[PDB]
């Protein structure tokens, strides 16, 4: 199915970090090994990873951010946070609280965080 | 069926500025008309566009920059700079000279040049 220290879920491999590092570092990490910092295409994969990050008790990366234009989010795969998927945020989140521009998982939903930050990270690659 | 001032390409409209403006300015411009400053998709696209600049000789704003981190390229639409794109750096490039954190079009391939800079534009919408 997946490489080690990798986890199938649904068709995809996912790779949890044991290092921490800011988005934009976190970004290439995945590239370099021909993976993409997570993005999100259903329910069931957001919680999958909600809960796997709530497990071990970690802020980790995802693939979104509005780095660009603030308020509009964007995943790396160059799609925008649908309106449907805007529910995973936190309560009170997005806030943009001192220019926050990369989501994290933080326990059951994302808050925008500082792009600077050391956080784990996750990329998932097909299973194929 | 583009509208007219807009061509046709591989189903997606450009429209090739003949103004000149800055960077920001060309992101907002190509927002105006429902478009976005042109997010190279595919080899192909790459090579039509490379062809429709170099043809006049200009200098030509994409949709990509390193203003959020230096040497992490990131396009406007969300979607960071992949390795296999990086090959389309001119030779040499980026060398973020005196700080250069947008990309234009520059004979064959990229260069990284200073924002501020007024140079053609290039916006990309789907025909539908
Ligand atoms: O939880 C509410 C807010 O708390 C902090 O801001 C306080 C002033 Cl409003 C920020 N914040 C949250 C976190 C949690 N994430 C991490 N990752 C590494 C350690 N903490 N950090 N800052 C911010 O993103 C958030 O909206
Ligand atoms: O060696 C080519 C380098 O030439 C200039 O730097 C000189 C000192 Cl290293 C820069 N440069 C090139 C250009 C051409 N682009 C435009 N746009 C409108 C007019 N010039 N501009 N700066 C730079 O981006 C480039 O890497
Ligand atoms: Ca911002
Ligand atoms: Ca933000
Ligand atoms: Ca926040
Ligand atoms: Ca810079
Ligand atoms: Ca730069
Ligand atoms: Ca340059
Ligand atoms: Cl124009
Ligand atoms: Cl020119």
């Given at each position: 199915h997946?490489?080690?220290?990798?986890?199938?879920?649904?068709?995809?491999?996912?790779?949890?970090?044991?290092?921490?590092?800011?988005?934009?570092?976190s970004?290439?990490?995945?590239?370099?090994v021909?993976?993409?910092?997570?993005?999100?295409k259903?329910?069931?994969?957001?919680?999958?990873?909600?809960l796997?990050?709530?497990?071990?008790?970690?802020?980790?990366?995802?693939?979104?951010?509005?780095?660009?234009?603030?308020?509009?989010?964007?995943?790396?795969?160059?799609?925008?946070?649908?309106?449907?998927?805007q529910?995973?945020?936190?309560?009170?989140?997005?806030?943009?609280?001192?220019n926050?521009?990369?989501a994290?998982?933080?326990?059951?939903?994302?808050?925008?965080?500082?792009?600077?930050?050391?956080?784990?990270?996750?990329?998932?690659?097909?299973?194929?």
């Amino acid at each position: 199915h997946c490489p080690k220290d990798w986890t199938f879920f649904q068709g995809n491999c996912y790779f949890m970090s044991n290092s921490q590092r800011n988005w934009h570092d976190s970004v290439t990490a995945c590239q370099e090994v021909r993976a993409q910092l997570v993005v999100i295409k259903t329910a069931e994969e957001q919680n999958f990873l909600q809960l796997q990050t709530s497990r071990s008790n970690r802020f980790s990366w995802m693939g979104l951010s509005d780095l660009n234009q603030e308020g509009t989010w964007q995943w790396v795969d160059g799609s925008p946070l649908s309106p449907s998927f805007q529910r995973y945020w936190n309560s009170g989140e997005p806030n943009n609280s001192g220019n926050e521009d990369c989501a994290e998982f933080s326990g059951s939903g994302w808050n925008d965080n500082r792009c600077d930050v050391d956080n784990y990270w996750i990329c998932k690659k097909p299973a194929a």
